[PDB]
Design a protein around this nucleic acid. Structure first.
Ligand SMILES: Nc1ncnc2c1ncn2[C@@H]1O[C@H](COP(=O)(O)OP(=O)(O)OP(=O)(O)O)[C@@H](O)[C@H]1O
Lengths: 346, 388, 271, 134, 181, 274
RNA sequence: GUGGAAAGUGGCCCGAAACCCUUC
């Protein structure tokens, strides 16, 4: 199942192994990201180190101008040591895009997470009532189910359980995910997320093809919710770098082992007949519902952006005029030159 | 093939089994003796050419006095009792004591090795125990009367012929107490006494109860002599199809090695050791019971299941033997106490081995081995207990 | 009852995996001295076998006379009825899971999975007839690892659920996309009529493994193995007994879409 | 929490910078305390994990890969100060404790030493690591 | 555990002096659980057939009290002929010296078939198939007892083959002065 | 007679390690080292060769004339010894090939190169497979650590729960020469050429099948790099200063050594021949 | 003229299931 991923907004996917001002040399609004290993290896020989100079990087950061223009005293190359170049939109650190031999690519785990959130959204939406939840929670240690039965829907049950006492992270995070995607009777919370119950193992999301580096750049970020110094820059993919992707559905996993798979997604997708046929349409339409409801949040969140800018309006005018499936890879104020972050269509 | 009597002519006769393997007449009579051995009440010492003469002797044959018969040969060897009862007033009632205890099968007969090791809480292995009382020959060069020798021999022999069936059956619990408990001590154990008499005792059975029986026997004997005597015990674990002559030549070598290297020591499991004379293969009982009081209730729960901290991380204790092998290959290096903390930090179990993480100067002062040498004899017996 | 081999067709592998590969151990799996990535045979054999028996589970309804001993089974699962044999095409409790094992010889001699991946159990235990070598990293990537340009780069995921994302991360250390793993695979050939419907029966499984993944978290990438074959050659008993430097060699042009060189299987072939 | 014996143990390691021809308990008896100070401050593992991969790769280059670590030892020496420069606020206040040991060690230990000489440093490199968790 | 002794604890283990036992014995009488296989299928059949196993630098030796012409004519060519795997064998000749006092009654150093003369001796029973048909039991004195009332217990002719197998047992002395008996 | 003791001496590289078992662990005698037991080498070296002649019995049939009354099969259907299929010898569960008489096993090409027993047969195996014992590179490699074994974990992955389970294996480290040796008696000089060609055939069945335990998924893939074909005719024992054959050593690939240089190696041993 | 002569510790088993390096 070969699909094509077009990039609509600025998109940033980044590890945390950031670029450092020892790698940057801002010149003519174009950053040449250096390779300091080869630079240090070709700066001792026919150069100097004084036993310390190339290892003297406990000096304060920034200041790339001297850092080349005197160490390259018309002695080194300008950017033969650069691995690649970017395009400045907007002299400090840079969040690096997740690479692969020096090439950006969309990791399929991020795509699977942004699909599975939509799957959770439609699973709680079109099946989240007490005459569909309690019938399954009673089958797996239904002492939780009699607490569910006081409410007509499990949304209020999880709003209760979140607002209950003794709330840690490890037990309270995965409980709604367990109720939707399958559980097991264990003594911890009277259910436990045994993750092998999940039908998402019938969903395969490959990693993308390598995106071309000539549409890879560095973008400014404003977060207008606090007067804290935010000179934050992210590596990103230009809107227009149409990549490819491979993602499909294993009907030959659900079709065989249709008894042990349980949960509210499995119950909500047994309703539409054979689960081999409707699983793909369920995930695609869950995408189409969730990435429209995010706009429905966002079309009133315009004053909550802080900057009522016409770019946001001209983007929302185009957000619901697409022939594929729009998605999102990552005070709510994360903006790239005012444009939103991470919106791609498939 | 059965006996090593090993020089008959064609006199040997195939019977009492698949009748294609020719078999000596001694072991023809002996399996028939074993078929009467649960229901046997005694023997009757008569002349060698009477009716019902099962086995012979140097002077006299024997008639197996079963539960209803009335044999006479002027002497009746009655087993494990002092009341003669239903034997006539012509013969000489001679009592004799035998540690007799053995697990009856669903029929009532003697369980075999394959019938016994199926009740092993853990791996399917057969436990074999062979002991000795320590420095007893010097103990009988110190009694200066026939009366003192008679009392000091009869009280010793009554332990290894009559007390053993009491300790196996579960009695004497008021002084035995906390031995290494691999499981619950059942009503009928899986323990078959092969030969207990004089000083020594040789007992086969399921290893999870052989192990508990060794410490029960030792601590009850420590109570029984008042601490002035000790007993050495070798232990062994074999496959159920292992020949018995190897099964005894292993534990005899192990009892001799625990005999040589401190004279009052158990040999729990054959461990790897360096060759310098400082690492002893055996274990003092006050060492091993201390260690099982130390490291077993922290890491091992009851009845074949690991502790709730080590639950679902049950390949952790296997890594400690791989750590300990570095100390085995060289005693002078110091990698072992480091890699132990490198293992225990990765799983959060910071406290389960405080002795293994830091090299103790107390042992290297007086040239004693490091505290990671001794813990694996506490590890493997748990590792055989929860293996599947 | 006979093994009676004459054969050993071999394929010389070359699984250049693209988009990652994460096979796990106690992190990638090089236990020996030259620290490296490698694919350890059994992770390729088991991923071949489970995928092939998933194919046979759905396609037993039409073979069903060809491979006649397959007809003793149902396409269900022995999960509810926890008996070690039930009459369904899943049995053999390993420790808690279930795999297909014919517990006889003559029922395993005809079974279209078990005649190619081996039986077990009481008295039977068929030899697997396939030999799956441990795929070591090729000499090209060894020379390109000695010169820097590191292989087995790490990768961090997170568990960012649908809560306040305090997502606990977990590094994975997969192999770099593009890694020639110098694979080799041997199939024992016995009694020729039992043969042509075997490697043709085998490659389809690998073709499914060309569509599916191997090695770890394949639901989020980590597959795409691309078995670009090298040899397809065959080593008869006519020179294991007398080695005259001769062999019957096929062609390894790109791949097979669906068995294009089915005709060239029998090019110089009588055994 | 932190007490001056622990940076003085670091100072014994840094001013007594020679450990190469010393006893194999001089390494371990200090390596606890070093790591104790290194765990008295924060020093979470994942920024130190870039260092250790350069050790293990050069350790495999020791195990019949080359004659020594001549040019690749510089990037072991470089990346420490690189992490120092990258570290900000709650880290550069703390990560210099890990930094002040490996630079004065590897200064003279970039004397192109033997594989048996460098192994005594790599064992100390490993020796610091576990007592982060202990 | 009186099994084997050093030479320095053997020139004075006899002659009535306080010897010392050694402990560095190169034995690994191990329990190697060998072969289980059927040509077509499984086989379970754990048959043990244990063997002996040595140390890193150890090895058997034996002695020769004879003229070196007869040694280099029969036995010394044969001791390199001897070199299933357990026939691992490299031969290296040597000389040796033993103090060995007055020869009233002294050790045999072999397994021994005596001429009816019993003095303080472990008994042995040695089988041996020796080209097919099972040799009889042939009661022997063990390694190292004391029959020196003029020995010379001849080798025993057997039956079963075409040419007769005839079993060793003739001994050679040493020096002991035993206390009484 | 006896005109014998050919020494094939060599080194066997386990390209992916070995699992000659005894957690399953390798055979470790007295120093902690592993080793190939010569029993396992001879045993696999006869299973491969016996199944070869099981396939090829109906067509040789004139060479090796005693291998004609067999007509291939196993005697496990008709549960009796001496059944003419190929092989009886019911030990406890298995069925191996042993000719039940000496006069037959002077001609059966498998049986006359690994022997025969049972009742009144007693054929000696004509071969001595010395256990291979970790040549002095990897002994000195072991002295500084280097972890000569390797704990390797497999799983039984299910398909309806996709659960798994640890089945550790602890195999020998991939790549280790073992100092491999073969000693062979050269009784019956007219048999000898085909005999050592058959032993080299059985060794050439290895490097393409599994030695050592849980094969067919890795764990085998051994390689004989055998250096020195020798000879010890009748003068190496009565003497031994000189006068024995030493063949070419360096890069003798066994799939090429089998005949492409063998008759250039045979004819020097034809020079003694007595 | 060897307590011998014939005797692979073997057969089956994916280190797998799930996890957006992202939020404030
Ligand atoms: N119940 C008993 N009554 C009388 N004598 C006994 C008894 N049990 C053992 N003996 C004597 O002990 C002697 C051998 O015992 P043993 O060798 O165990 O003594 P020991 O002093 O423990 O020696 P070691 O410590 O070397 O075993 C025998 O001569 C036997 O007479």
């Amino acid at each position: 199942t070969e699909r094509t991923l077009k990039v609509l907004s600025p998109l940033h996917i980044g590890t945390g192994n950031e670029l450092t001002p020892v790698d940057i040399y801002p010149r003519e609004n174009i950053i040449h990201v250096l390779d300091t290993e080869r630079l240090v290896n070709d700066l001792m020989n026919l150069g100097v180190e004084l036993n310390e100079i190339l290892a003297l990087l406990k000096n304060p950061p920034g200041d790339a101008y001297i850092w080349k223009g005197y160490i390259e005293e018309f002695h080194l190359d300008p950017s033969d040591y650069s691995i690649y170049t970017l395009k400045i939109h907007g002299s400090m650190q840079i969040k690096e895009f997740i690479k692969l031999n020096g090439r950006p690519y969309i990791p399929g785990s991020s795509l699977k997470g942004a699909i599975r959130t939509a799957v959770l959204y439609k699973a709680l939406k079109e099946c989240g009532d007490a005459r569909a939840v309690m019938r399954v929670v009673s089958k797996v240690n239904g002492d939780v189910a009699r607490d569910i039965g006081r409410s007509e829907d499990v949304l209020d049950y999880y709003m209760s359980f979140l607002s209950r006492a003794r709330i840690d992270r490890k037990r309270a995070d995965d409980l709604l995910e367990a109720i939707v995607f399958g559980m097991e009777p264990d003594r911890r919370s009277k259910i436990r997320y045994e993750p092998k119950r999940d039908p998402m193992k019938a969903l395969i999301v490959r990693d993308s093809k390598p995106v071309g580096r000539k549409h890879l750049a560095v973008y400014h970020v404003e977060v207008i919710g606090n007067p804290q110094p935010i000179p934050i820059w992210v590596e990103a993919i230009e809107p227009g770098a149409a990549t490819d992707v491979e993602i499909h559905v294993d009907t030959e996993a659900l079709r065989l082992n249709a008894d042990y798979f349980n949960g509210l997604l499995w119950e909500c997708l047994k309703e539409r007949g054979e689960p081999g046929e409707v699983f793909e349409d369920f995930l695609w339409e869950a995408v189409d519902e969730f990435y429209t409801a995010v706009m429905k949040y966002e079309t009133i969140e315009v004053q909550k952006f802080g900057r009522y800018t016409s770019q946001v309006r001209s983007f929302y005018a185009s957000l619901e005029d697409h022939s594929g499936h729009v998605l999102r890879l990552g005070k709510t104020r994360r903006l790239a030159d005012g444009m939103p972050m991470g919106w791609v269509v498939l | 093939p059965v006996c090593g009597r090993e020089l008959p002519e064609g006199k040997l006769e195939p019977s009492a089994s698949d009748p294609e393997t020719k078999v000596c007449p001694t072991c023809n009579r002996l399996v028939s003796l074993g078929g009467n051995l649960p229901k046997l009440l005694g023997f009757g010492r008569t002349a060698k050419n009477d009716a019902g003469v099962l086995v012979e002797g140097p002077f006299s044959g024997f008639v197996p006095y079963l539960q209803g018969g009335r044999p006479v040969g002027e002497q009746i060897l009655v087993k494990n009792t002092l009341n003669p009862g239903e034997i006539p007033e012509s013969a000489q009632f001679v009592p004799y004591f035998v540690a007799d205890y053995f697990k009856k099968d669903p029929k009532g007969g003697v369980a075999t090795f394959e019938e016994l090791s199926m009740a092993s809480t853990g791996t399917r292995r057969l436990g074999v125990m062979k002991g000795d009382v320590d420095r007893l020959g010097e103990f009988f060069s110190s009694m200066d009367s026939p009366s003192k020798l008679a009392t000091a021999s009869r009280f010793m022999d009554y332990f290894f012929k009559g007390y053993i069936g009491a300790i196996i059956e579960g009695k004497f619990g008021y002084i035995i107490g906390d031995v290494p408990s691999l499981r619950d001590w059942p009503e009928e154990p899986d323990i078959v006494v092969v030969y207990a008499g004089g000083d020594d005792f040789f007992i086969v059975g399921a290893w999870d109860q052989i192990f508990e029986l060794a410490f029960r026997v030792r601590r009850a004997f420590n109570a029984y002599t008042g601490g002035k005597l000790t007993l050495s015990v070798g232990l062994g674990y074999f496959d159920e199809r292992t020949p018995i002559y190897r099964m005894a030549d292993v534990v005899s070598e192990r009892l001799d090695t625990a005999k040589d290297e401190g004279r009052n020591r158990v040999f729990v499991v054959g461990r790897s050791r360096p060759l310098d004379g400082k690492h002893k293969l055996s274990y003092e009982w006050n060492h091993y019971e201390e260690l099982w009081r130390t490291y077993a209730p922290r890491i091992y729960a009851g009845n074949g299941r690991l502790k709730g901290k080590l639950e679902s991380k049950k390949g952790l204790l296997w890594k400690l033997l791989e750590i300990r092998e570095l100390y085995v290959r060289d005693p002078n290096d110091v990698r072992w106490a480091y890699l132990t903390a490198y293992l225990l930090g990765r799983h959060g179990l910071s406290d389960l081995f405080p002795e293994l993480v830091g090299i103790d100067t107390k042992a290297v002062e007086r040239k004693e081995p490091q505290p990671v040498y001794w813990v694996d004899g506490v590890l493997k017996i748990v590792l055989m207990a929860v293996r599947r | 009852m006979d093994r009676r081999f004459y054969g050993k067709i071999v394929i010389k592998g070359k699984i250049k995996a693209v988009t990652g590969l994460h096979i796990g151990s106690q992190p990638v799996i090089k236990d020996p001295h030259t620290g490296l990535p490698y694919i350890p045979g059994s992770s390729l054999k088991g991923r071949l076998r489970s995928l092939f028996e998933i194919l046979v589970n759905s396609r037993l309804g039409e073979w069903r006379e060809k491979y006649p001993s397959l007809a003793n089974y149902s396409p269900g699962s022995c999960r509810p009825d926890n008996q070690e044999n039930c009459g369904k095409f899943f049995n053999r409790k390993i420790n808690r899971g279930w795999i297909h094992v014919c517990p006889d010889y003559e029922t395993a001699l005809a079974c279209p999975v078990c005649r190619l991946f081996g039986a077990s159990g009481k008295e039977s235990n068929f030899p697997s007839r396939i030999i799956v070598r441990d795929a070591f990293l090729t000499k090209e990537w060894e020379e390109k690892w000695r010169a820097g340009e590191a292989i087995t780069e790490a990768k961090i995921e997170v568990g960012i659920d649908r809560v306040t994302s305090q997502a606990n991360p977990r590094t994975n250390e997969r192999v770099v996309a593009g890694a020639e793993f110098e694979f080799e695979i041997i199939y024992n050939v016995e009694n020729t009529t039992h043969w042509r419907d075997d490697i043709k029966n085998l490659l389809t499984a690998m073709a499914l493994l060309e569509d599916s993944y191997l090695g770890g978290s394949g639901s989020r990438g980590y597959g795409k193995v691309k078995f670009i074959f090298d040899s397809f050659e065959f080593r008869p008993l006519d020179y294991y007994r007398t080695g005259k430097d001769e062999d019957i060699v096929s062609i390894d042009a790109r791949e097979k879409s669906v068995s294009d060189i089915l005709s060239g299987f029998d090019s110089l072939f009588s055994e | 929490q932190w007490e001056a014996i622990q940076p003085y143990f670091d100072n014994v390691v840094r001013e007594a910078k020679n450990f190469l021809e010393w006893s194999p308990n001089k390494r371990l008896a200090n390596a606890v305390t070093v790591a104790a100070y290194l765990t008295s401050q924060g020093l979470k593992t994942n920024q130190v994990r870039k260092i250790l991969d350069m050790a293990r790769t050069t350790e495999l280059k020791v195990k019949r890969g080359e004659g020594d670590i001549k040019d690749d030892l510089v990037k072991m020496r470089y990346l420490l100060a690189y992490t120092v420069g990258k570290a900000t606020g709650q880290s550069k206040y703390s990560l210099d404790a890990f930094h002040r040991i490996l630079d004065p060690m590897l200064e003279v230990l970039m004397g192109s030493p033997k594989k048996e000489n460098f192994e005594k440093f790599y064992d100390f490199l490993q020796a610091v690591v576990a007592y982060h968790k202990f | 555990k009186a099994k084997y002794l050093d030479l320095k604890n053997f020139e004075l283990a006899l002659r009535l002096r306080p010897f010392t036992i050694p402990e560095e014995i190169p034995y690994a009488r191990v329990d190697v659980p060998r072969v289980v296989l059927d040509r077509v299928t499984q086989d379970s059949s754990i048959y043990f057939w244990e063997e002996i196993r040595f140390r890193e630098k150890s090895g058997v030796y034996f002695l020769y009290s004879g003229p070196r012409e007869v040694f280099d004519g029969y036995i010394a060519p044969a001791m390199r002929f001897l070199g299933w795997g357990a026939g691992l064998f490299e031969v290296e000749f040597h000389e040796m010296k033993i103090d060995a006092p007055g020869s009233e009654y002294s050790v045999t150093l072999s397994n021994a078939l005596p001429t009816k003369t019993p003095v303080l001796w472990r008994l042995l029973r040695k089988g041996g198939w020796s080209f097919g048909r099972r040799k009889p039991r042939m009661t022997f004195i063990a390694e190292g007892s004391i029959v020196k009332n003029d020995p010379g217990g001849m080798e025993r002719l057997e039956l079963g083959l075409s040419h007769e197998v005839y079993v060793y047992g003739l001994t050679f002395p040493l020096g002991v002065e035993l206390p009484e008996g």
